[PDB]
């Protein structure tokens, strides 16, 4: 289902960056639909945003851990 923080930690940095890029692109497409008044899956924008926040949180933790 949705990607848990445990699975995100085991990823290499390259896969996390690529996942982050896909989500930001998907968010851009979804916010365009929201401005047009019709969203295909009305509950999806919220999950994409929190997923982006999850990745950025683990990114900061991993950097601090080595710091």
């Amino acid at each position: 289902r949705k990607l848990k923080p445990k699975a995100l930690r085991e990823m290499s940095p390259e896969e996390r960056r690529e996942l982050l890029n896909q989500l930001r692109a998907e968010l851009v497409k979804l916010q365009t639909q929201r401005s047009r008044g019709f969203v295909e899956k009305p509950g999806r924008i919220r999950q994409v945003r929190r997923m982006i926040a999850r990745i950025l949180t683990i990114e900061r933790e991993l950097a601090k851990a080595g710091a």
């Binding site: 692109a25 851009v28 497409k29 916010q31 365009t32 639909q33 929201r34 401005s35 047009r36």
Partner: protein, 81 residues
């Protein structure tokens, strides 16, 4: 920095007739940053950028692509149309 695309009647007309994409960006983005972001994200060439701040406080950029890249094709590829 890009928040969304503008797909209104005016924006679509400018895409077909003038090879321009219309985007909403963060209000503090400059024309230099807007051009860099579009080139990096979408692998196109930007000819010039015109910007304005809407009465609702959002920054809108009319981004003209160079003469080898199609604004209509890019919107279709992104799936925002």
């Amino acid at each position: 920095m890009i928040k969304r695309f503008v797909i209104t009647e005016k924006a679509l007309r400018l895409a077909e007739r003038e090879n321009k994409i219309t985007i909403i960006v963060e209000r503090t983005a400059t024309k230099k940053q807007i051009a860099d972001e579009v080139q990096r994200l979408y692998n196109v060439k930007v000819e010039k950028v015109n910007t304005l701040i809407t009465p609702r406080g959002e920054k809108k950029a009319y981004v003209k692509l160079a003469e080898g890249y199609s604004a209509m094709d890019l919107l279709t590829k992104l799936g925002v149309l």
